[PDB]
Paper text:
HAMP domains are small modules, approximately 50 amino acids, that dimerize to form an entirely parallel four-helix bundle with two helices (AS1 and AS2) supplied from each subunit. Aer2 is a soluble receptor that contains three N-terminal HAMP domains, a gas-sensing, heme-containing PAS domain, two additional HAMP domains, and an MCP KCM. The three N-terminal HAMP domains of Aer2 (named HAMP1, HAMP2, and HAMP3 from N- to C-terminus) provide examples of two distinctly different conformations: HAMP1 and HAMP3 are similar to the Af1503 NMR structure, whereas HAMP2 has a comparatively distorted four-helix bundle structure in which the AS2 helices approximate a two-helix coiled coil and the AS1 helices splay outward at the C-terminal end.
Notable was the L44H mutation, which generated a CW lock (i.e., exclusively tumbling) phenotype in both CheRB+ and CheRB− cells. Crystals of L44H and V33G proteins were obtained in the context of Aer2 1–172 using conditions similar to those of the native protein. The L44H mutation modified the HAMP1 domain structure while leaving the poly-HAMP2/3 domains largely unchanged. The His44 side chain redirected from the bundle core towards AS1. This caused a tilt in the AS1 helix and a 5 Å shift at the top of AS1, resulting in a loss of secondary structure at the AS1 N-terminus. In the L44H structure, the tilt of AS1 drives the helices apart, disrupting upstream helical packing and resulting in a loss of observed secondary structure at the N-terminus of AS1. In the context of a transmembrane MCP, if this helix disruption were maintained, it would decouple TM2 from AS1.
Numbering used by the authors:
A (entry chain A), B (entry chain A): 7 to 156
Write the structure that this text describes.
């Protein structure tokens, strides 16, 4: 009678904690045989709430990292990247993905600058890369510059 | 005796479902007064598991969208963007953030191409934007091209 209520209150308290976002309490083992199923599920649920909390926090950090990277680049510090090494899982892969895509565009941009700077110096040895898709328009444009400049 | 066990099994089953990822069952209301706390928490937990599931799915979609955008740009279709409008919350903001940052770099790149293309035609009216930070190196480079070309 007394124990039954106590064990019931314990389960209510643990569930209440989960609901309120208090995931630090250690669930532990069941008090008696008839509560094994309840506790098995409670422990499993807790592990899941903790994992999802961590993953969602990583995403929040990813948004802040992107925000700072954007701020840095608008200020001209284009070497700045999102510190993917400080993230993990999917958040880290997305961060690396953004860094690589931005880096790829910067590389094409600097290639253009490098080639035309040379033409400006009378050095016509360099040729713009042969780009695909819409980027092919850049290749033709720069070739046109070369032909006309000399 | 019979009812007690039945109501206890119901709570075990609901918790078991949550654990296994079956969040579609409708919890409903408590069967008797002494179970109000349990059910209140169960409903709240379910709402949270569903919300976190949705948010994590959005992130998975964000990673795929970035992957496809990267694939498209490497192929030269640089007008392609991550469809942020099809996402929501933080996932959507990150997507828009990536689209804007990439677009900003492309704009600087095309500005460079536009200016030098003009110089190649003997049209020295356009001047490269005055860029900050490390980007200032691009401004000086292109100015140098202008001065030397004419
Ligand atoms: Cl720096
Ligand atoms: Cl297209
Ligand atoms: Mg010269
Ligand atoms: Mg000319
Ligand atoms: Na990617
Ligand atoms: Na941003």
């Amino acid at each position: 009678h007394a124990v039954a209520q106590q064990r019931a209150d314990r389960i209510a308290t643990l569930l209440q904690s989960f609901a309120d976002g208090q995931l630090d309490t250690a669930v532990g083992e069941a008090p008696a045989p008839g509560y094994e199923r309840h506790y098995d599920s409670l422990r499993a649920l807790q592990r899941q709430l903790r994992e999802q909390r961590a993953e969602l926090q990583q995403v929040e950090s990813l948004e802040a990292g992107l925000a700072e990277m954007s701020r840095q680049h608008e200020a001209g510090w284009i070497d700045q990247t999102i510190p993917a090494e400080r993230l993990e899982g999917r958040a880290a892969r997305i961060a690396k993905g953004v860094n690589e895509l931005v880096a790829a565009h910067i590389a094409v941009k600097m290639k253009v600058v490098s080639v035309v700077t040379a033409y400006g110096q009378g050095n016509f040895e360099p040729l713009m890369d042969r780009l695909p898709g819409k980027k092919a328009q850049i290749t033709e444009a720069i070739d046109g510059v070369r032909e006309r400049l000399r």
